[PDB]
Amino acid sequence: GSSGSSGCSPVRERRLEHQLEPGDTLAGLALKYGVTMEQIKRANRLYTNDSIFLKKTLYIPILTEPRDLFNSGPSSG
């Protein structure tokens, strides 16, 4: 009766560093990935008196499901 500690906790939601450009629009990024402007903002409380451009880089919340035609596994590049 050998019992060990098995069971990892994989992440669900992550953030991607996007080199915000001077010619980018909130509505653009939202769709560009698959989210809603609000989400992104509320996610990084970007809501400020002045345009968001004030910043330099904005992170994007990646929403993916455990449902995939084929899963590679723990294998990493």
Swiss-Prot record:
The modification Phosphoserine is found at S9. It comes from Homo sapiens (Human). It comes from the Eukaryota. The chain holds residues 32 to 95 of 227 of the full protein. Residues 16-60 form the LysM domain. Signal peptide: none annotated. This is LysM and putative peptidoglycan-binding domain-containing protein 1. Keywords: Phosphoprotein. The keyword S-adenosyl-L-methionine does not apply. GO terms for cellular component: nucleoplasm.
